Amino acid sequence: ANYSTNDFKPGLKVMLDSNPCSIMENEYVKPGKGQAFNRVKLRNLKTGKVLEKTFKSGDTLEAADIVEVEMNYLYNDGEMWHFMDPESFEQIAADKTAMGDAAKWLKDDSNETCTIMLFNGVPLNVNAPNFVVLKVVETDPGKPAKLETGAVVRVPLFVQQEESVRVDTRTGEYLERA
Numbered sequence: 001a002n003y004s005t006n007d008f009k010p011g012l013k014v015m016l017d018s019n020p021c022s023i024m025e026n027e028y029v030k031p032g033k034g035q036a037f038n039r040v041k042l043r044n045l046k047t048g049k050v051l052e053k054t055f056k057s058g059d060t061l062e063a064a065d066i067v068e069v070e071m072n073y074l075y076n077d078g079e080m081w082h083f084m085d086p087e088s089f090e091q092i093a094a095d096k097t098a099m100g101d102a103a104k105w106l107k108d109d110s111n112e113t114c115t116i117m118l119f120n121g122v123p124l125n126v127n128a129p130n131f132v133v134l135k136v137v138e139t140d141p142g143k144p145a146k147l148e149t150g151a152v153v154r155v156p157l158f159v160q161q162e163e164s165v166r167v168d169t170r171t172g173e174y175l176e177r178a
């Protein structure tokens with residue numbers, strides 16, 4: 001940190017063209033003859049895009065200050081989502097962009113444990129738990145259903161308002177009755 005091609009490993013957090021990246025794939029190439037080099041697959045952490053780059057040995061990459069933390073959700077005010085560390089009791093706030101898709105899965109007062117990716121101490125991405133239990137607020141007698149967070153999902157015809165369902169947040173899909 002600085003890192004050289006020798007350091008490259010899967011999941012390594014590096015800066016590339018002024019963007020924090022995570023190394024997905026690293027492959028060693030020993031040419032005959034000549035300097036060995038690395039072909040690396042990188043995920044851009046701000047964009048989610050995947051990059052393919054070749055690094056000659058002797059190439060250098062600055063480390064990116066990327067850390068992932070588990071934190072409990074407290075509340076949001078429509079613009080900032082607030083989390084507390086259950087051991088440290090330090091608080092951090094994430095904005096709408098950092099929350100992304102996770103905001104629609106977090107119930108008021110749920111206290112869900114979330115995974116927060118921090119870039120230079122600032123939340124960059126947030127992930128909700130894989131599965132959450134949310135109440136159906138709007139649905140008529142599958143069929144569309146509006147959950148209490150405003151998220152919309154398809155539920156079986158038998159589900160009724162004020163009933164609760166378990167949802168897979170990765171796919172945004174109903175899983176089962178709650």
Ligand SMILES: [Cl-]
Pocket residue numbers: 142154155156174
């Ligand atoms: Cl369904």
